[PDB]
Curated annotation (Swiss-Prot), chains A, B:
Organism: Caulobacter vibrioides (strain ATCC 19089 / CIP 103742 / CB 15) (Caulobacter crescentus)
Catalyzed reactions per annotation: 1-haloalkane + H2O = a halide anion + a primary alcohol + H(+)
UniProt key word Transcription regulation: no
InterPro entries, alphabetized: AB_hydrolase_1 (IPR000073), AB_hydrolase_fold (IPR029058), Epox_hydrolase-like (IPR000639), Haloalkane_dehalogenase (IPR051340), Haloalkane_dehalogenase_1 (IPR023489)
Native organism taxonomy: Bacteria, Pseudomonadati, Pseudomonadota, Alphaproteobacteria, Caulobacterales
Record-listed E.C. numbers: 3.8.1.5
Record's subunit section: Monomer.
GO molecular-function term, one example from the UniProt record: epoxide hydrolase activity
Protein name (database record): Haloalkane dehalogenase
Length: 308, 308
């Protein structure tokens, strides 16, 4: 693969983002080494709260959630998907596939040897993060899903399809503008600029351009088979599994029901509806941090595992 | 469903079979209540060693293994699949499907609330038993697979296909004769009669007739999707998972490799090749019992789980 790397000057002076970058080198099956970025804040003796972003955001989306949780004594880890943030960015849309993202982030997870994880995932952060849970369930102590899903090509998803068709018809993808359109609150120019930071020009956006087309909404899509298999693992996942979808995101709203129907770990936890749009982290960051803090505190009294 | 029930007189005076019958009523989705038979020998405070038979045998196949393990202080449980043994027998070939067998035995397993299980499975005992492991992995402390598989419609299986075509072309299925043809040692007339016992005439054999046709050897077969999903669970199964295939069964020999390739619990156990034919329990019962006894003894020092 041809690979782009955003210059570091782009990440200077960003509103409410001073977290030091960490990097991991993962090797693709084609031999290409890709550098993935994450932040890691707080004490290493605490279990990691893993925060996963989706399309077309980056770990910046969690900046307030990170600050709140760190202030409460937690360890917080937030990676950038390949194509996004401070991670490397394959140069062709055709370089990105759902299975490739899963393989890349699986390597990242194993190489950083993250365990005892409390996962919060949203959009593609969940499409990929939930595949990590299904591949490595004993690495996860609890999961929170918000405005996400694990599609299997079934039914209609017209909310999402409206976004899909727009995202493919448009000749350019104005990322800060999209973030603002998917948040109830009005993002400042500085905040929108931070979302534009990874992408000095359109050539850096090929992962952002193709992501919607990778969502498996038809039976013929790539990754339908793999996602159906992953659901069989999630049907056995009995540790706390919380839904925290927002009230004003018709793109993903329909994704919640299958978790409640199929995942045993949803039975003995309280679910909530958060206030906000698709990018709920901009609308309800304090509430998300409070939810995760309380979830962590209750783990010893909840169902848990040993010997991994 | 129309359902046949073999008269109890058929099970009197069988060579080396005096174990008292236990019964469980399971209700099919179509409303039909089916009675399933099992034997349960030894102390209830010991973990159950669950022995599962396949086509066209019944729990009688394990009579010596049961005796050996009971003499060693173990609890042993051996059920008859619907269509077989002392279990009820739907009257039409079309009543039997792979998914129905899994549903029936899943109900059986849950209703008897078997836990801490050490499973030994062979032929369809494994095609169904391994689906129980994938559905309820925390119920299983260890698994031993012998002369079995979990097919996903891939590759060629010409050994099995030779049996398939015979089994479908033949107008009648002489069950004792088949058992003798699939065992290295010569079964006595009494032993063959015990294998014929469940089937007073051909009308009782519809489950035995169709079973080979249910094995998913083409991509279009029913249960391919479900078995691929189950494999994703087995890819996470890290408790002892032993292969004990025999040396002289070309029908199933090719089924072993995928377990060693995909199941993590195969890594830190010793695998063995048993002597004998397809129905290896007739050829090496003492060795099977010794293997299971040793496997049970080592569990506390092996990888194990808590809190289920
Ligand atoms: Cl998308
Ligand atoms: Cl068969
Ligand atoms: Co290097
Ligand atoms: Co750090
Ligand atoms: Co999306
Ligand atoms: Co559990
Ligand atoms: Co909800
Ligand atoms: Co504990
Ligand atoms: Co009754
Ligand atoms: Co008994
Ligand atoms: Co068979
Ligand atoms: Co384990
Ligand atoms: Co072997
Ligand atoms: Co222990
Ligand atoms: Mg907004
Ligand atoms: Mg706290
Ligand atoms: Mg023989
Ligand atoms: Mg013993």
């Amino acid at each position: 693969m041809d690979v782009l790397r955003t210059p570091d000057e782009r990440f200077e002076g960003l509103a409410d983002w001073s977290f030091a970058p960490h990097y991991t080198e993962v090797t693709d099956a084609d031999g290409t080494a890709l550098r993935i970025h994450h932040v890691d804040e707080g004490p290493k003796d605490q279990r990691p709260i893993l925060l996963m972003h989706g399309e077309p955001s980056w770990a910046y989306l969690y900046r307030k959630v990170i600050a709140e949780l760190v202030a409460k004594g937690h360890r917080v880890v937030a990676p950038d998907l390949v194509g996004f943030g401070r991670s490397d960015k394959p140069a062709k849309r055709t370089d990105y596939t759902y299975e490739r993202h899963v393989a890349w982030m699986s390597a990242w997870l194993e190489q950083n040897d993250l365990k005892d994880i409390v996962l919060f995932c949203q959009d593609w952060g969940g499409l990929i993060g939930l595949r990590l849970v299904a591949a490595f369930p004993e690495r996860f102590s609890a999961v929170v899903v918000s405005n996400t899903g694990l599609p299997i090509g079934v039914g209609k998803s017209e909310g999402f399809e409206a976004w899909l068709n727009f995202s493919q018809n448009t000749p350019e993808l104005p990322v800060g503008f999209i973030l603002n359109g998917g948040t109830a609150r009005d993002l400042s120019d500085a905040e929108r600029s931070a979302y534009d930071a990874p992408f000095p020009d359109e050539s850096y956006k090929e992962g952002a351009r193709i992501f919607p087309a990778l969502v498996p909404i038809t039976p013929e899509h790539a990754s339908v088979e793999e996602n159906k298999a992953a659901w069989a693992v999630l049907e056995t996942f009995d540790k706390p599994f919380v839904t925290a979808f927002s009230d004003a995101d018709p793109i993903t709203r329909g994704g919640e029901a299958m978790f409640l129907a199929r995942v045993p770990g949803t039975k003995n936890v309280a679910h909530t509806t958060l206030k906000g749009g698709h990018f709920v982290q901009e609308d309800s960051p304090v509430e998300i941090a409070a939810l995760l803090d309380g979830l962590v505190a209750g783990l010893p009294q909840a169902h848990h595992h040993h010997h991994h």
